């Protein structure tokens, strides 16, 4: 795995010693090269995970996420070039280093074999994210958003730390392989119930769950474009990955303890999508759509059926790409109009046609237009829930309807109607912005061709 | 359009009702001859109370006529195709591109239409030169507590253009295509 | 009706508007940025049957050749790929194994 980790580390000295005119260029080049190298990990075995060493391993769950992170870094740099263009060289290098550190941490999280190592790194991801949000945010709510995000995540994580150490003391090892081979069923004792809660709540906080999702709107809206990209593309999937890993030692208590969270998420998807319907901020709308799409994954993980897990992995990858793209488009519009009010800018389709096409394709992916991987994951989760209970189809179909409604509503309000007259600073789309949108869309549509790669280890 | 007024006079309100009533009657009477026959009958009804002088009585009659209009309102009245509510209303709105986008054209694109953009520069200069007088003129003709009506004054002296004229003059054509 | 100031302003605005509309008129030429690909190849190449047939070839002959060739990699290679409904047998003779059968008949009263 060091074939990916070591170059990622070597990015930092390069960025620090790169010329002020070559910082972005060098970073983008070598980040793309690192993504190319990470592509090799997709060759997962049929049964055994790719155990590179005692500390790092990968499976058909970890590899897509690793590729996603290594691919997301260059696009984040490209997006960050615009607003961080009047910054001093040292601070620009600092931002690049924060992004690189975040990518390195995420790689190690997705490859860590030891559960406590995963906890350490997955909670280490907070520091770069917090710094990015609080320092390079544009509004005054950035400080409160960072506080909310950090405190939510820590309040979830600390009981998880206690529980993990308890497991290490009792079982003797926290290695995923040993934990899976030496799995022992949990009883219904209150101690086991609280252990299950401690092991689940942290990941429930990580991937916004209705009731504990209050941090996400603030974080996504206040954070800079790159920060929002990671927040909505990988940092949320951290919760899903950790939950799928930790559910191995949380059975059969999951059957009894899932009902609260299952109902919370099944109603939360509807609630959040309805909230999207009546939103005035573009980034807030995108964030709430993310909340709903992640609630789908939460349901899938809780049900613990093989189809559910496959759909969960596919949905995670698809949502990462789509949400990052949506935030990038909103960022371009925001940079041009210097406001996040959705109704402020209207009829942008006339002024910017190609960006409007990008908007259309992104919204289509958001509403899970067949045969996009978004639809593949959503349909798999829907079928798994239908097997769990036939009544689920009601809420699932209603959520699909509301998602389509609010996505098309966003497209109509922004990229349709009479153009706003006073807004005269809408210049033609830059090549960089179009390239960013293309590098978000094309991989997803290509992934639809060979979904087996992103269908998880249960394929 | 034209500058709005604070209120509508009773005479104005009756005239508005008259046009609406005839149009709805025309919607009811598909055949032209049928409409013309009943149009005069309706016109006579307005003529019958044309002499009516008592404002309270006239206002009472106006209320009754509007109530009658609502009861006899055509559920699907004819609306002109390009009129608000028409089938072709706002149809070509998307094709209407603001002129300021032309300044963002690449030099190659501006080279495709050199004469036009050259004349466009002349229009730009005209706007800037007259702008200062436009604001100054508005202040001179502005009442103490600001404008009470949205009506704008014309060019009092030669060499000046009507204040706030650029958008009205350079507005998009009905059919850009 | 129109107040004198309003009417005068309308007149002035109309004058300027009409000037703007006249300005919005293409010049005698619209310089077109400078066709080596369409030189000798498109000098005086056949404009009736060659054009119709080349469109026909590129749009059907090449695709049909490619698809019929893909049959060689698809139906002959993988089993149960192109499943044809068993041909309806009406009392008669087959091909591979021949053989014939014929049922009884009822009285035929009229046409």
């Amino acid at each position: 795995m060091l074939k990916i980790i070591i170059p990622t580390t070597m990015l930092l000295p390069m960025t620090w010693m790169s010329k002020h005119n070559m910082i972005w260029i060098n970073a983008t080049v070598h980040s793309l090269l690192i993504s190319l190298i990470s592509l090799s990990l997709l060759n997962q075995l049929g049964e055994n995970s790719l155990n590179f060493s005692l500390t790092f391993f990968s499976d058909s769950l970890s590899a897509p996420l690793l590729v996603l992170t290594t691919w997301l870094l260059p696009l984040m740099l490209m997006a960050s070039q615009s607003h961080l263009s009047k910054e001093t060289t040292t601070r620009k290098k600092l931002y690049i280093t924060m992004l690189i550190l975040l990518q390195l941490f995420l790689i190690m999280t997705f490859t860590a074999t030891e559960l406590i190592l995963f906890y350490i790194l997955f909670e280490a991801t907070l520091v770069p994210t917090l710094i990015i949000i609080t320092r390079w945010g544009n509004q005054t709510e950035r400080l409160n958003a960072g506080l909310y995000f950090l405190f939510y995540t820590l309040a979830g994580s600390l009981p998880l730390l206690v529980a993990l150490v308890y497991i290490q003391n009792t079982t003797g090892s926290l290695n995923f392989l040993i934990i899976h081979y030496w799995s022992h069923p949990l009883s219904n004792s209150w101690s086991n119930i609280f252990m299950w809660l401690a092991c689940i709540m942290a990941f429930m906080v990580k991937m916004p769950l209705y009731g504990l999702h209050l941090w996400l709107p603030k974080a996504h809206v206040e954070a800079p474009i790159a920060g929002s990209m990671v927040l909505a593309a990988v940092l949320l999937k951290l919760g899903g990955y950790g939950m799928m890993r930790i559910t191995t030692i949380l059975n059969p208590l999951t059957n009894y303890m899932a009902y609260p969270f299952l109902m919370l998420s099944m109603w939360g998807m509807i609630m959040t999508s309805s909230i999207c319907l009546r939103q005035t901020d573009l980034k807030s709308l995108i964030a709430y759509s993310s909340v709903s799409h992640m609630a789908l994954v939460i349901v899938a993980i809780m049900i613990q059926t093989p189809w559910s897990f496959m759909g969960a992995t596919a949905l995670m990858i698809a949502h990462g790409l789509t949400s990052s793209m949506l935030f990038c488009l909103a960022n371009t519009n925001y940079e041009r109009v210097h406001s996040r009010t959705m109704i402020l800018a209207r009829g942008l389709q006339t002024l910017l046609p190609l960006m409007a096409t990008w908007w259309l394709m992104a919204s289509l992916t958001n509403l899970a237009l067949p045969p996009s991987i978004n639809l593949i994951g959503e349909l798999f989760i829907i079928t798994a829930s239908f097997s769990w209970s036939n009544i689920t189809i009601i809420l699932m179909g209603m959520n699909m309807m509301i998602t389509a409604l609010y996505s098309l509503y966003m497209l109509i309000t922004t990229q349709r109607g009479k153009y706003t007259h006073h807004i005269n600073n809408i210049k033609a789309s830059f090549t960089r912005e179009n390239a960013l949108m293309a590098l978000h869309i094309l991989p997803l549509l290509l992934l639809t061709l060979n979904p087996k790669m992103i269908l998880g280890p249960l394929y | 359009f034209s500058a709005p007024a604070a209120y509508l006079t009773h005479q104005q309100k009756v005239l508005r009702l008259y046009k609406r009533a005839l149009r709805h009657l025309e919607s009811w009477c598909v055949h032209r001859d049928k409409y013309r026959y009943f149009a005069c009958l309706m016109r006579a009804r307005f003529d019958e109370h044309k002499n009516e002088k008592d404002m309270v009585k006239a206002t009472q009659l106006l209320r009754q006529a509007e109530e009658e209009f609502w009861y006899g309102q055509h559920p699907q009245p004819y609306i002109f195709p390009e009129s608000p509510g028409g089938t072709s209303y706002e149809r070509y709105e998307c094709y209407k591109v603001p002129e300021w986008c032309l300044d963002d054209w690449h030099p190659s694109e501006k080279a495709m239409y050199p004469d036009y953009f050259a004349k466009r520069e002349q229009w730009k200069r005209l706007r800037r030169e007259s702008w200062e007088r436009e604001v100054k003129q508005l202040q001179e003709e502005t009442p103490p507590g600001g404008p009470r009506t949205e009506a704008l004054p014309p060019a009092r002296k030669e060499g000046d253009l009507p204040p706030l004229w650029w958008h009205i003059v350079t507005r998009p054509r009905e059919r850009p295509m | 009706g129109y107040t004198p100031d309003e009417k005068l302003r309308l007149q002035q605005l109309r004058e300027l508007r009409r000037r703007w509309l006249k300005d919005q008129e293409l010049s005698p030429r619209e310089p077109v940025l400078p066709f080596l690909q369409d030189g000798a190849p498109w000098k005086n190449v056949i404009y009736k049957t060659y054009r119709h047939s080349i469109f026909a070839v590129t749009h059907v002959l090449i695709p049909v050749w490619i698809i019929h060739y893909y049959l060689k990699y698809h139906v002959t290679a993988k089993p149960y790929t192109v499943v044809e409904r068993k041909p309806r047998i009406f009392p008669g003779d087959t091909i591979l194994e021949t053989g014939e059968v014929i049922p009884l008949m009822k009285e035929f009263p009229d046409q």
């Binding site: 789309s429 | 591109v97 603001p98 986008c101 690449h106 | 919005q24 619209e30």
Partner: peptide
Amino acid sequence: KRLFIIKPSGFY
């Protein structure tokens, strides 16, 4: 009469 059609810049 050939009239200039105001359009967004399409070169980019």
